[PDB]
Amino acid sequence: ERPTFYRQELNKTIWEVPERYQNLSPVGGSVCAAFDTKTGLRVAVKKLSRPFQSIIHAKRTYRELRLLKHMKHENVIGLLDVFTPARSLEEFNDVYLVTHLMGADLNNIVKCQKLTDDHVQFLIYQILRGLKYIHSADIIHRDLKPSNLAVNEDCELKILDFGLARHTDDEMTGYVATRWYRAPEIMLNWMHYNQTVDIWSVGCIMAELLTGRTLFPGTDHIDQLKLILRLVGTPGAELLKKISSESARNYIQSLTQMPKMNFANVFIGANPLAVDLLEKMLVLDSDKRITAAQALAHAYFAQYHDPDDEPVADPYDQSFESRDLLIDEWKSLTYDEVISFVPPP
């Protein structure tokens, strides 16, 4: 049956939710913390803002719901519930997404406690386990950074935030964490990117866990490229060919050639195995970076690697991405997905 819903205003916005969700408290679409009386879980309830305002917004709402509906993995955000107060398609205008409530993110950790090498092993292991799963479905996160890695008191980690609105040019400008973890090829639009961009971000994140400092805190895209090439060396002829942008290729060739630095001297005191893994992640040529599946088998993770407990994902059909639909068609597809949702056990 349809649950009974109740309404409340929570600063400037109307929330209409099933009775099971109690004690809604704004924390961040808008997000409310709540108590799920049915499961006994503390939950986050996100009310999507203006979900079908334009074609681009209706498609993004569909995308985020598709992605969240698919993720069933211990180290990736999962959907506990999705609902609408609407009783039919004709009256459908609001989408609410429910997930486990997350206390802290990796920023809260890296910043407010010292991480042993064993903590770095555990945290990075879990990121790579979630990424093996995400990548096996041909999903690219594209925006891995400490603020979208939730971490509980047992150091257990989930990857959050996919299907999100693409960052504006302004949001990627200047001295900003929104860009510090991005692979160079996507930061500078060197070429068609793929899932290897996520591995670059893990390397940036792992080095920050080890040193307590951002690896590439560029003050703008160019300063950041310079920080990156200082560590990993300027590109060779082979990588230059793969840079399809004539302009970017030409700029990068204006730079004084530099060799790759010795990472043992950059990451002083680090476990030599961590150093080795960082060298295999932070390779400029994305073709040559270690994959998530490969990294799980790296000796740095000996204590955690269990090849029988590193699952892959069911197939994920994203043919919708290439489809051109009207707002109401994207909105009808989303409604189908709300209506057919089945909670996890």
Ligand X SMILES: Cc1ccc(O)cc1Nc1ccnc2cc(-c3csc(C=O)n3)ccc12
Question: Using CB under 6 A as the criterion, which residues of the chain lie in contact with ligand X when the complex forms?
Answer: 27-28, 31, 33, 44, 46, 77, 97, 99, 101-103, 160-161
Q: Which residue's CB is nearer to ligand X, number 69 or number 280?
A: 69
| Dist CA 210 CA 270 (whole Å) | 7
Residue whose token pair is 């989930």? 158
Per DSSP, 33 falls in state E
Residue whose CB is less far from ligand X, 31 or 327: 31
Q: List b or e across 20-30, with b for residues whose CB sees 16 or more CB atoms inside 10 angstroms.
A: bbeebeeeebb
28 annotated binding-site participant: yes
Q: Where are the beta strands (DSSP E) in 262-335?
A: none
- Please report how close the Cβ of residue 42 comes to ligand X at its closest, in angstroms: 8
Q: Is 315 helix (H, G, I), strand (E, B) or coil?
A: coil
46 is in an annotated binding site: yes
Specify the residue, 64 or 185, whose C-beta has the smaller distance to ligand X: 64
* Helix 196-211 with 117-136: angle, nearest 10 deg: 170
Does the annotation list 17 as a binding residue? Answer: no
- Minimum Å gap between C-beta 29 and ligand X is 8
Cite the active site residues. Answer: 161
Half-sphere exposure of 178 (CA within 13 A, CB side): 12
For residues 28 and 344, which CB has a smaller minimum distance to ligand X in the complex? 28
Q: Please state the closest distance from residue 94 (CB atom) to ligand X, in A.
A: 14
Shortest spacing between CB 276 and ligand X, in angstroms: 33
DSSP track, 204-267 = HHHHHHHHSS-S---SSHHHHHHHHHHHH-PPPHHHHHH---HHHHHHHTTSPP-PPP-HHHHS
DSSP per-residue codes, 327-344? HHHHHHHHHHHHHT----
Cα separation, 244 vs 209, whole angstroms? 34
For residues 257 and 261, give the distance between their C-alpha atoms in angstroms, rounded to a whole number: 12
**27 annotated binding-site participant:** yes
Q: Which is nearer to ligand X, 99 or 136 (CB)?
A: 99
Q: Is 236 labelled a binding residue?
A: no
37-48 core/surface letters (b: 16 or more CB in 10 A; e: else)? eeeeeebbbbbb
> Is 30 part of any known ligand binding site?
yes
Which residue ranges make up the annotated binding site?
A: 27-31, 46
Q: Which residues are annotated as a binding site for ATP?
A: 27-31, 46
